[PDB]
């Protein structure tokens with residue numbers, strides 16, 4: 001059977017994996033998990049047995065179940081090598097992983113749904129904006145040394161796969177991107193590639209009709 | 213020159229790297245970065261040029277500067293292969309990375325100093341406890357399927373290197389570990405190994421005298 005991705009249309013972490021799967025040419029099926037309706041499907045007993053962390057994505061592939069988007073992408077990289085998400089040179093690989101982790105560990109978790117719920121309605125917007133602006137202040141500086149056409153040199157990497165979904169989140173939270181011209185430029189360049197379009201939140205099984 | 217690690221004695225993420233460096237037998241120097249005194253040395257202009265994200269660890273090695281503890285550890289794994297932080301089988305590698313990311317992306321960032329400062333004095337303790345108990349609820353369930361002597365089978369891996377420092381944080385935040393017998397058992401087993409002792413917060417250049 002085809003690999004099965006458990007995804008939510010609006011989920012940044014899910015988008016990451018959908019981009020990687022498109023990049024690697026892997027035909028997969030999606031099982032949508034609605035993260036918001038009736039408290040969220042991620043809390044169901046069935047989904048909790050799939051991922052005790054109660055998050056998407058989860059990928060069933062090659063007879064196993066993998067959670068954590070970067071762990072998934074590293075698995076895909078090791079088993080379906082081309083196109084490469086990571087370059088061959090260990091020093092350049094470290095830079096790609098550094099940027100991916102800055103986003104995936106340093107920004108996204110602090111603006112995740114469950115965290116925003118704990119912050120509360122009155123402060124969640126400002127909180128999300130602060131986390132993202134702080135992260136992008138740093139990332140924009142780093143990209144001055146690392147970026148070519150893309151985040152790390154001239155080939156698409158895992159850092160780019162993390163960048164686009166986090167920038168879309170920045171737009172959703174009404175963050176001013178004008179002080180981040182390099183993030184902005186690279187984001188536009190990546191969005192011109194088919195693998196970032198076919199995988200897009202507005203083209204998902206579970207995209208609400210009003211957003212298609 | 214020897215590799216230079218920028219570290220804080222109490223930093224969980226720094227401990228990770230110190231364990232990996234000990235594991236790989238790499239002789240290194242530490243430059244302490246005091247994260248608390250006078251607002252924190254991580255905000256100095258000099259440290260900001262080292263790491264715009266204003267966090268430890270940072271490692272200078274082989275003529276480059278790497279930030280992000282998991283990116284550092286993956287670099288060390290690729291360049292100094294034994295003892296292995298990741299197993300040879302891509303499916304087992306995915307499990308090690310999943311657990312490492314659960315901790316490093318799913319728990320630690322939400323109990324980091326800068327986040328606790330934004331939560332505020334009145335709520336930070338309860339916040340940290342909630343994040344850690346939620347993460348450990350999930351992790352303890354996952355380890356039921358994955359763990360042998362250690363988090364993933366019978367060889368120490370990157371998941372173990374992430375586990376111990378996060379458990380020490382759990383102790384510092386007064387989290388009840390009694391419902392986590394597998395995390396507790398594995399933690400005790402790893403703490404019996406020299407590489408987790410030589411690297412310990414209480415044996416650092418910058419350990420306050422009262423804690424030595």
Ligand SMILES: N[C@@H](CCC(=O)N[C@@H](CS)C(=O)NCC(=O)O)C(=O)O
Pocket residue numbers: 011012013014035040042054055056057067068069070104109112113114115313317318
């Ligand atoms: N570090 C993770 C985080 C996964 C995650 O936070 N997923 C979000 C969607 S982007 C989620 O399922 N949140 C559910 C919730 O907050 O209740 C990974 O990269 O897979």
Ligand SMILES: N[C@@H](CCC(=O)N[C@@H](CS)C(=O)NCC(=O)O)C(=O)O
Pocket residue numbers: 101105106223224225226247252254266267268269279280281282316321324325326327
């Ligand atoms: N994802 C990171 C996080 C690094 C991090 O949060 N470091 C903490 C120490 S454990 C820090 O320097 N915090 C400084 C602050 O919060 O101002 C990594 O694994 O290196």
